[PDB]
């Protein structure tokens, strides 16, 4: 063209602020981890109290 002809290295760009993450697929063992006695994977909060190894 021969109108106002802007340069190739003078053309603007733009960078976005919103970023994407990668999917993780949380857990398939999550409904089965409880602290009661009739659970498959049983937890113990006895060392969350006073002390121990």
């Amino acid at each position: 063209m021969a109108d106002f002809s802007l340069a190739t290295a003078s053309q603007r760009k733009e960078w976005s602020n919103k970023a994407h993450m990668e999917y993780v697929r949380r857990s398939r063992f999550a409904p089965y981890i409880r602290n009661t006695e009739n659970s498959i994977f049983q937890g113990y909060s006895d060392l969350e109290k006073r002390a121990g190894d």
């Binding site: 006073r50 002390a51 121990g52 190894d53």
Partner: protein, 52 residues
């Protein structure tokens, strides 16, 4: 893994080390070697000519 306070046991044993460090310097000062005019060399790091 423990219940005993290691912090307070390390602060009491640290004030008590700078008391042993003071009389370890007075014993080293009494056994000094006065060479010539305020030149005190310790007995371990003195030569045979500084002792003569």
């Amino acid at each position: 893994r423990t219940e005993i306070d290691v912090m307070n046991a390390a602060k009491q044993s640290l004030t008590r080390y700078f008391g042993e460090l003071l009389r370890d310097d007075i014993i080293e000062a009494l056994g000094s070697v006065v060479t010539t005019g305020d030149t005190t060399v310790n007995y371990g790091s003195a030569s045979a000519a500084n002792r003569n």
